């Protein structure tokens, strides 16, 4: 089938190829940078930049302080959305799915893998809490350094990670002539579908949408 213009009928394997091309682009510094959208049960959205830390069949992984705004929103409403935008390539990737907090064990393993300065940073910074000035931090940070000198920084109880499980993945490719390519993968049932709806690996269904 002279196909669409994709590399894989697997949304995650497609993200991979696009992600690698981004990593290999000199003009993109943080290719794993993504904007995470979350909201309260009520319907009040929020969004902030984040770094994607590992991905695959299980989903997209990221870490934060469970007590940060995003944490308190994901825990009281396990639904999130991700947006990857790589301007140099004019590409955008959107991921929608339910979030599942990670196992404290894995978080721990990943935590101690970070640079000591990043670990210490996660302890002084009671993320999302109010403070007096930028020095307050420079100070605490300094103190905890001498404290944990030749020591293991314990992973804050409230520090961990989540993994988004891909329910909907979109691929956008800006074109010069404005007729942007746009394919949406979504997991449907009808194991019996639209004329323009096509079969993707697993229970994946894709189709092109008007830009």
Ligand X SMILES: Cc1cc2nc3c(=O)[nH]c(=O)nc-3n(C[C@H](O)[C@H](O)[C@H](O)COP(=O)(O)O)c2cc1C
Ligand Y SMILES: Cc1ncc(COP(=O)(O)O)c(C=O)c1O
Residues with active-site annotation: 178
Report in angstroms how near the CB of residue 178 gets to ligand Y at its nearest.
6
Tell me which of 17, 23, 25, 51 binds ligand X, using CB under 6 A.
51
- Residue with Cβ nearer ligand Y (48 or 199): 48
Are 105 and 160 within 8 A, CB to CB?
no
Q: Which residues of 41-80 are buried (b: 16+ CB within 10 A; e: fewer)?
A: eeeeeeeeebebeebeeebbbbbbbbbbebbebbeebbbb
The footprint of ligand Y (CB under 6 A) covers 51, 114-115, 118, 174, 180
- Residue with Cβ nearer ligand X (92 or 119): 92
If contact means CB under 5 to 8 A according to the sort of partner, which of ligand Y, ligand X, a copy of itself, none does residue 114 touch?
Answer: ligand Y
What are the beta bridge partners of residue 173?
A: 91, 181
Write down the residue that tokens 């290719």 correspond to: 31
Determine, following the binding rule CB under 6 A, whether residue 110 of this chain makes contact with ligand X: no
CA-CA distance, 87 to 80, in Å (whole number)? 23
Determine, following the binding rule CB under 6 A, whether residue 62 of this chain makes contact with ligand X: yes
Report in angstroms how near the CB of residue 203 gets to ligand X at its nearest.
22
Which among 200, 204, 197 is positioned nearest to 9, based on CA atoms? Answer: 200
Cβ atoms < 10 Å from Cβ of 125: 16
CA-CA distance, 92 to 142, in Å (whole number)? 40
- Residue with Cβ nearer a copy of itself (16 or 47): 47
Determine, following the binding rule CB under 6 A, whether residue 46 of this chain makes contact with ligand X: yes
- Enumerate residues 15-44 that contact ligand X by CB under 6 A: 30, 33
Q: In whole angstroms, what separates CA 127 from the centre of its chain?
A: 18
Write down the residue that tokens 């994607």 correspond to: 52
The footprint of a copy of itself (CB under 8 A) covers 4-5, 27, 29-30, 33, 35, 37-49, 77, 79-83, 85, 87-88, 92, 94, 96, 117-118, 121, 124-134, 137-138, 141, 172, 177-179, 181, 194-197, 207-211
Residues that bind ligand X (CB under 6 A): 30, 33, 46, 48-51, 62-64, 68-70, 85, 92, 128, 172, 174
């Amino acid at each position: 089938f002279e196909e669409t213009h994709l590399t894989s009928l697997d949304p995650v394997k497609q993200f991979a190829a696009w992600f690698e091309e981004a990593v290999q682009c000199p003009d993109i510094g943080e290719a794993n940078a993504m904007c995470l959208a979350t909201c309260t049960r009520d319907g009040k959205p929020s969004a902030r930049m984040l770094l994607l830390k590992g991905f695959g069949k299980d989903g997209f992984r990221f870490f934060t302080n469970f007590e940060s705004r995003k944490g308190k929103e994901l825990d009281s409403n396990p639904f999130a959305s991700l947006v990857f935008y790589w301007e140099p390539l004019n590409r955008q990737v959107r991921v929608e799915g339910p979030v599942k907090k990670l196992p404290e064990e894995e978080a721990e393993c990943y935590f101690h893998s970070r640079p000591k300065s990043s670990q210490i940073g996660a302890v002084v910074s009671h993320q999302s809490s109010v403070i007096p000035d930028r020095e307050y931090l420079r100070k605490k940070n300094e103190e905890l350094e001498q404290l944990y000198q030749d020591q293991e920084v314990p992973k804050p109880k409230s520090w961990g990670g989540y993994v988004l499980y891909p329910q909907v993945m979109e691929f956008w490719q800006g074109q010069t002539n404005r007729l942007h390519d746009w394919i949406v993968f979504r997991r449907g049932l009808p194991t019996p579908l639209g004329p323009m709806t096509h079969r993707g690996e697993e229970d994946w269904l894709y189709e092109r949408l008007a830009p």
